[PDB]
RNA sequence: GGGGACGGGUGAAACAGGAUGAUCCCGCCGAGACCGCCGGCCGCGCAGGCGCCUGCCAAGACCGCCUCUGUCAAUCAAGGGCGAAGGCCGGGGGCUAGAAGGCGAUCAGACACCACCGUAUUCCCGGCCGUAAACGGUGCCGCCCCGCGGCCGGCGCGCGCGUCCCGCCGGCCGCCCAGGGAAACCGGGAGGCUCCGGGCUCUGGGGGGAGUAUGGCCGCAAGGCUGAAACUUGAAGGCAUU
């Protein structure tokens, strides 16, 4: 299954008690359009379009 | 609508993810999580319950299960009682598939009265 | 429980001392 | 000192209650000493309790609730935050938080 | 059609394991129970002979089509007795409710009144009625607790006996089949019980097949093979 | 002379004459001078009645079981001992019962069994106490007092025989094949040894 | 029987379990324990303690009372009975857990914690034992004492009439006015007490040595009960503040 890109609805908050990893619900940008919440790294911000390797799996709401 | 019974076992240790024809003496196919990790603690995973399932439900298509009632349940006995991270997962995994849902219903072995747990009276002083 | 266990280290020393009695008398 | 007049127990005209055990720990305390928590929580995650609805063919199915009772010792309850220490007068409110 | 290998090619296991519909007792709108997958006859197991005494839970809801509210949380066990036509006849094995509605009776405060009757049917079956019943709070009330007094409690549980017995004390297995699935019986108690006090959820549990005669065929054609006779 | 277990002679009608029959019994507790036992298949459920075990109800103690239909009895004879009636089958007109040594053997339902504990329990429970009692017994039983070990004995007497220390020399279980004169010591021993459990 | 390869177990592992088909699913059977959720500032009992169903048998407190008796009472050395668990002695029984023992980890070591297997034991009957932080760390009977609530049992009064309301009595409780106390707290007393006296029994007198020694009694034993001195030391202890 190739990667399906998400657009970033709201940005959660910063999680790894480092606070590197960042909590975001990604929309699927294509497709059912299912609101996912997903961990990213780095700068992320509103409407972020980032490439999801496999989309089925989600991180614990706002955790 | 071709019905069956998929047990799922969300317990710590492993998730077994496995469908049987209603009457429970045939089974459809059946799957785990350590089937699908190579790490023994990531046997009780969601991930592993997605992968074991979605490799599960190619075996049920082939075989003609369109839908499953599903039967979840946890270590249960004197022990347990609440599910493991898998079983969430291989509902998901299931209704993602195309599996069309049935009766869900909670499987747990549940005592009417109980032989002594093992931990001893001061437990596990881990 | 050092207050246990010293009546426990207690116990096994008058037994052994009526041990020793019991070879003599 | 006596820090709690109930002792930390309900215990009131009774000289011996039952054993409960600790989910979490296995322990052996008291029925008067443990947590007691009930829960009724729904069968699936609330996350895929909408889709799992969609799926299901049997119109008008309602998604089981699974109703379970917690119990734990105070050392398997206080490590796990599900009772947290006190003030001393915070320790006197028997209400409980919201 | 639910069948697989009968007309399709199937994995090593199942290209030997052809299917064969199961059909509940008449009483039940849906007949169709399902479809069952048996291995074909090899040497000394004949397929028919195979799925000669399967079970099946089968959810009143499913059973009987219509309003889940009411008959959503009972559950029928049905047993293959006899395979006729390449369909398996059921007969009665239990009735339960399920898990769920069994945890949503409890509450705390309230008085659980629960209690076994062997009741032997006209048809040769001895059969454990378990009713549970609730006491619930008054119309007004001062206290909290619905606790009731040692007279109430004695009442109700020889009110419970006494109904089951001119309930279901000349019951033949089609009339408590019909009786179960229109919760008749449940509801009689429900009254006796509300005259001694006010009750909540009270209803037979579960009932269950403790001693069955042999050769009930005669007891198929009365339940699944005809509809007719019970009406 | 050689039982325990007292015996009661209790007088029949004689079926085929005008006389009376008397016939020997091993005695259920309770049986007493005059009592009126029953024999058959319509004989109540009374102890000391001898009634086929298909009619005996289940979880009744009973003695002198027959083993097979008209064997005059032969199973629960020694004093206290019983069996229980476990199950019936009438499927295949075979009744289980559970043995003194709690094996269980499927009887046929018509074999016929007397009800009750067979009288003279608890014998075993006074300790002999002297030879002298262990000499009065076996008298009455037979020659198998008293019993030398063969350890004691010589090599040609004994397998174990006789070494310069008194010792067994070799391991004492001994096979199933073993021919008359070898097997003297734990005959096809399955385990060995006393250990808690079962 | 079905189905196919990993199961267990952990914090992560590992040791056992598995193509002699494990785990998993379902039917069925045997064995013994145990009685869930309801289940509690519920209740009962002299304490220790007490929750399956259906009977059987004998109780007990409380309440009500224009019933009887007429001080029959209170507290108690000696004496009698009871007494959790573990232990012990005979019979059984043996499902679970599991002192010991054995293993796999851990660690510097680990014969600990954790995993795993498992004996005594756990359970019943007939006894011994006679102890627990057996605690309310608070003897028993009696009197008065301040409000404010909760629950339980019985009874009475209004009132439409409700498992209302207001009492009364007994119990179990929470807060607490005085008052007490070194304070924590008690306040149904730890109040009415340097303004000291209702009755009765028991115990203590700085901390060790030492519950040791010896003698007695008791028990099958384990041990119980009674119980020193020589000698040592200047604190030990309570509660509260930082």
């Known amino acids: 299954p190739e990667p399906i890109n998400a657009r970033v609805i709201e940005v959660l908050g910063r999680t790894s008690s480092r606070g590197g990893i960042t909590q975001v619900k990604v929309e699927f940008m294509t497709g059912e359009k299912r609101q996912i919440i997903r961990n990213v790294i780095g700068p992320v911000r509103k409407d972020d379009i980032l490439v999801l390797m496999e989309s089925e799996r989600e991180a614990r709401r706002l955790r | 609508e071709a019905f069956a019974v998929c047990h799922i076992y969300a317990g710590k240790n492993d998730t077994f993810i496995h469908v049987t024809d209603l009457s429970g003496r045939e089974t459809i196919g059946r799957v785990s999580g350590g089937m699908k990790v190579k790490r023994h603690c990531d046997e009780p995973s969601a991930y592993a319950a997605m992968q074991a399932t979605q490799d599960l439900i190619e075996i049920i298509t082939d075989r003609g299960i369109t839908a499953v009632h599903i039967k979840i349940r946890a270590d249960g006995g004197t022990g347990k009682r609440v599910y493991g991270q898998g079983g969430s997962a291989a509902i998901r995994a299931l209704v993602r598939g195309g599996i069309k849902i049935g009766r869900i219903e909670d499987s747990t072995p549940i005592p009417t009265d109980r032989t002594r747990h093992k931990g001893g009276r001061r437990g596990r002083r881990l | 429980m050092r207050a246990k266990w010293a009546k426990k280290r207690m116990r096994k020393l008058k037994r052994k001392r009526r041990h020793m009695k019991a070879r003599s008398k | 000192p006596v820090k709690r007049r109930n002792n930390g127990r309900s215990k009131y005209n009774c000289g011996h209650t039952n054993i409960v055990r600790c989910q979490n720990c296995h322990r052996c305390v008291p029925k008067d000493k443990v947590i007691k928590r009930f829960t009724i929580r729904n069968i699936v995650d609330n996350t895929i309790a909408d889709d799992v609805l969609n799926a299901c063919v049997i119109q008008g199915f309602a998604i089981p609730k699974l109703y379970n009772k917690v119990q734990y010792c105070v050392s398997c309850s206080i490590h796990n935050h599900i009772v947290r220490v006190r003030s001393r007068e915070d320790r006197k409110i028997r209400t409980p938080p919201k | ?231 | 002379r050689g039982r325990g277990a007292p015996l009661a002679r209790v007088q029949f009608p004689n079926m085929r004459g005008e006389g009376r029959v008397n016939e020997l019994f091993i005695a259920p507790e309770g049986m007493y001078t005059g009592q009126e036992v029953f024999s058959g298949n319509k004989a109540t459920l009374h102890i000391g009645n001898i009634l086929p075990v298909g009619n005996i109800p289940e979880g009744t103690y009973v003695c002198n079981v027959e083993e097979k239909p008209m064997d005059r009895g032969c199973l629960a004879r020694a004093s206290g001992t019983y069996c229980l009636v476990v199950a019936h089958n009438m499927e295949t007109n075979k009744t289980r019962i559970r043995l003194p040594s709690g094996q269980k053997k499927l009887i046929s339902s018509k074999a016929r069994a007397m009800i009750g504990l067979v009288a003279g329990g608890g014998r075993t429970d006074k300790p002999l106490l002297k030879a002298g009692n262990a000499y009065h017994k076996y008298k009455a039983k037979r020659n198998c007092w008293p019993v030398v070990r063969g350890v004691a004995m010589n090599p040609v007497d004994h397998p174990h025989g006789g070494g310069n220390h008194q010792h067994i020399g070799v391991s004492s279980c001994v096979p199933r094949n073993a021919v008359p004169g070898q097997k003297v010591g734990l005959i096809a021993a399955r385990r060995t040894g006393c250990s808690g459990g079962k």
């Open chain 5, 1 to 231: 059609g639910k069948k697989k290998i009968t007309q399709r090619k199937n994995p090593d296991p199942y290209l030997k394991k052809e299917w064969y519909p199961v059909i509940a007792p008449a009483h039940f709108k849906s007949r169709h129970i399902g479809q069952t997958p048996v291995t074909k006859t090899a040497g000394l197991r004949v397929a028919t002979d195979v799925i000669n005494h399967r079970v099946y839970e089968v959810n009143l809801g499913d059973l009987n089509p219509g309003a889940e509210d009411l008959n959503g949380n009972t559950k029928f066990y049905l047993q293959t007795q006899l395979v006729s036509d390449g369909k398996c006849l059921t007969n009665f094995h239990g009735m339960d409710i399920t898990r769920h509605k069994y945890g949503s009776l409890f509450r705390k405060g309230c008085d659980c009144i629960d209690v076994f009757m062997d009741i032997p049917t006209t048809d040769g079956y001895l059969l454990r009625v378990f009713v549970i019943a609730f006491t619930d709070r008054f119309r007004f009330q001062r206290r909290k607790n619905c606790h009731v007094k040692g007279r109430v409690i004695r009442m109700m549980r020889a009110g419970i006996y006494e109904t089951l017995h001119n309930e279901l004390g000349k019951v033949s297995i089609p009339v408590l089949v019909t009786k179960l699935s229109n919760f008749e019986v449940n509801a009689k108690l429900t009254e006796a019980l509300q005259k001694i006090t006010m009750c909540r959820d009270v209803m037979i549990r579960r009932v269950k097949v403790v001693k069955r005669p042999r050769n009930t065929m005669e007891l198929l054609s009365t339940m699944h093979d005809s509809n007719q006779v019970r009406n």
